[PDB]
């Protein structure tokens, strides 16, 4: 055993002699294919997303590349990796979280939404007719019974809830940087969380962005509507990183 092939265990999703599933270990290397990184940091009154926006051309329109999607009125996400799979799983997300409201009468929790999105994904892991979707969703939203929430599901299907997270290529550099700033414990106001997110992406890529290279999706307790910040408001927070 121990890292050994035995039959058709490296092509379809059956077990291998040592105990792992190699068609799923492989789907994670497809998240780093996209060459994108996304941070999401939680606050005491808001939750935030910040993403890389990359337009190779000036032909490609910059406004229809986005990775922030409104799942419902109160539930934003950010899709990382194989872009075709992204839109496919956001289609299915929207659908359930709207189906939910139809069968129970109230806006879905962000908790559950991801549960059900992970539960659809797991099914692909256990059947041999298809590969898992090669993408990684992050949901944010404000519950009214426990404050701001961040969930993040995987191609295997293991959404756990977080205080701050990243996905994509530079995933290990981000969690290093974040966890040092979760042990100090600031006051995590709205301004200090938008700050932590941007400067966590800035130092792991070493860029220092113009408002045209990031897009920030944010959701607050004063206003539970999932907003996407415009390039004017993103630049106000970027010239405040220069002062500090």
């Amino acid at each position: 055993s121990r890292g050994s092939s035995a039959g058709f265990d490296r092509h379809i999703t059956i077990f291998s002699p040592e105990g792992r599933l190699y068609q799923v270990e492989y789907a994670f290397k497809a998240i780093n294919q996209g060459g994108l990184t996304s941070v999401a940091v939680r606050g005491k009154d808001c939750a935030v997303i910040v993403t890389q926006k990359k337009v190779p051309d000036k032909l490609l329109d910059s406004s229809t590349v986005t990775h922030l999607f409104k799942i419902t009125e109160n539930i934003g996400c950010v899709m990382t990796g194989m872009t075709a799979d992204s839109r496919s799983q956001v289609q299915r997300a929207r659908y359930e979280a709207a189906n939910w409201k139809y069968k129970y009468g109230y806006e879905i929790p962000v908790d559950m939404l991801c549960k059900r999105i992970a539960d659809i994904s797991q099914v692909y892991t256990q059947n041999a007719e298809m590969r898992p979707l090669g993408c990684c969703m992050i949901l944010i939203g404000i519950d009214e019974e426990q404050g701001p929430q961040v969930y993040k599901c995987d191609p295997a299907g293991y959404y756990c809830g977080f205080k701050a997270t990243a996905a994509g290529v530079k995933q290990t550099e981000s969690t290093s940087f974040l966890e040092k700033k979760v042990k100090k414990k600031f006051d995590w106001t709205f301004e200090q969380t938008v700050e932590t997110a941007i400067t966590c992406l800035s130092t792991v890529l070493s860029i220092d962005f113009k408002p045209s290279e990031i897009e920030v999706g944010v959701v607050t307790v004063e206003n539970p509507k999932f907003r996407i910040l415009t390039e004017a408001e993103i630049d106000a927070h970027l010239v405040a990183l220069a002062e500090r």
Partner: protein, 242 residues
């Protein structure tokens, strides 16, 4: 590959799906098609190769009507192109029944990507060997131009090309400005790009197929009248000598 490419249902040890990347090459072996969005419509240019004197000119099209106010220009295996064009037609007729207006192009783009994506997840099927561009004008949304590839990805574009010379023609579109011209001005520059990127040393001849859809025709999609096609080919032979 050894088992890493027989199925569409197998990730590579890289993270890549060779069966979707292999479909991309079927687009590289097909002639060029370019799309250029001006500020009051769209213009489609297809480098249809004439391979014999046995084919009726003005036939074997690659410019379709997906709906009365949407163009589609294809590149790749034509058989799948005529398969996609019927799924769209079906979808955009479907939408007009249940919602009672014309289907917005941003939306039709997504539905047809969905349907292309579902063919990269199963063993029962192979991906489509076909990329294409959707182009539509309204007076309540502007000109729009999306482009879908075998992967199932759609993006917006100001100008787009697909086919065997996608690299060369994207450069010649970036020299051109477009955010200020009308249709009447662009159509000549489309023809001009096609002549520059085509090889008459790799192909016997070619026929230039042009399409409005914009303020001129009232949001309808239509081919370009024979008169304005002769002028746009004549203006392209002169700028080619220079």
């Amino acid at each position: 590959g050894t088992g890493y490419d027989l199925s569409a249902s197998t990730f590579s040890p890289d993270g890549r799906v060779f069966q979707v990347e292999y479909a991309m090459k079927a687009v590289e072996n097909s002639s060029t098609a370019i799309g250029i969005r001006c500020k009051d419509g769209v213009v489609f240019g297809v480098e249809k190769l004439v391979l014999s004197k046995l084919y009726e000119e003005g036939s074997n099209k690659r410019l379709f009507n997906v709906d009365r106010h949407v163009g589609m220009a294809v590149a790749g295996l034509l058989a799948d192109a005529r398969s996609l064009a019927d799924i769209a037609r079906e979808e955009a007729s479907n939408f007009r029944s249940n919602f009672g207006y014309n289907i917005p192009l941003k939306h039709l783009a997504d539905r047809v990507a969905m349907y292309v994506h579902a063919y990269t997840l199963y063993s029962a099927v192979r991906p489509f060997g076909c990329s294409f561009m959707l182009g539509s004008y309204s007076v309540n949304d502007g000109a729009q131009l999306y482009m879908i590839d075998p992967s199932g990805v759609s993006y917006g574009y100001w100008g787009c090309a697909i086919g065997k010379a996608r690299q060369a023609a994207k450069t010649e579109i970036e020299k051109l400005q477009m955010k200020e011209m009308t249709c009447r001005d662009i159509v000549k520059e489309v023809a001009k790009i096609i002549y520059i990127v085509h090889d008459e040393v790799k192909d016997k001849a070619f026929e230039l197929e042009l399409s409005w859809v914009g303020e001129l025709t009232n949001g309808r999609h239509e081919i370009v009248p024979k008169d304005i096609r002769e002028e746009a080919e004549k203006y392209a032979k002169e700028s080619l000598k220079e």
